[PDB]
Amino acid sequence: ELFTNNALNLVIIFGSCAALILMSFWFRRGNRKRKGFLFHAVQFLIYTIIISAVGSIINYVIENYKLKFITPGVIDFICTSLIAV
Amino acid sequence: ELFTNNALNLVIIFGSCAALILMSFWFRRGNRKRKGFLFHAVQFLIYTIIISAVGSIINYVIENYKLKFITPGVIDFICTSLIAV
C-alpha cells in the first residue's frame, strides 16, 4: 500500500531523506567548504547510518507483507561487507 | 517441480550463473589479461561465494521436498573442508 506502508515505515524511511539532506549539507560543507580526514570520517559515519536505517526498512518489509526467504543473516552480512568496502 | 522450484530457489540458484559469468570475466581478466596474487585471491573469494550459495541451495531442497537424513552439519563440514583444500 501507500498510506499504510508509510505509517508502518515510521522514521526509518525518512532516514534516507534526512541522509540526503545531510549529504547536500556536506556538499555545502556547512561552516567551511573544505575536505580531508574528518570530512571522510563523517561521510562514512552517515553512510553507516544509512545502512543501519535500511536494515530496519527491509526488516519491516518482510514482516508486514510476507516473510518469504530473505533470511536476514545474509542481508546483514551484505551490509557489513559494504561497510568494510 | 520446475516453476515452483525456480520460484522457491530465489537468487540462490542464480548465484551459480552469476559466478560462471564472473569466472568468464576473470578468464577475460577485466581491465588487463594478467594473473598473480590478487587474481588467485579473488578467484578463491568467488569460489567461497559459490559454496555459500550452494549451502542455501541445498538447505532449501530438503526443506521444500523432504528433510530425509542429510544432517546439514556434515554438508557444512564438507564445505569447510573444500574451502580449506
From Swiss-Prot, chains A, B:
Topology, Cytoplasmic side: 28-37
Location(s) in or outside the cell: Cell inner membrane
Cysteine disulfide links: none
GO biological process entries: cellular response to osmotic stress
Periplasmic side: 1-6, 59-74
Assigned GO CC terms: plasma membrane
Transmembrane intervals: 7-27, 38-58
Key words, A-Z: Cell inner membrane, Cell membrane, Ion channel, Ion transport, Membrane, Transmembrane, Transmembrane helix, Transport
GO MF annotations in UniProt: identical protein binding; mechanosensitive monoatomic ion channel activity
Similarity comment: Belongs to the MscS (TC 1.A.23) family.
Functional description taken from the UniProt entry: Mechanosensitive channel that protects cells against hypoosmotic stress when highly overexpressed.
Subunit structure: Homoheptamer.
Name by which UniProt lists this protein: Low conductance mechanosensitive channel YnaI
Species per Swiss-Prot/TrEMBL record: Escherichia coli (strain K12)
Positions spanned in the full protein: 4 to 88 of 343
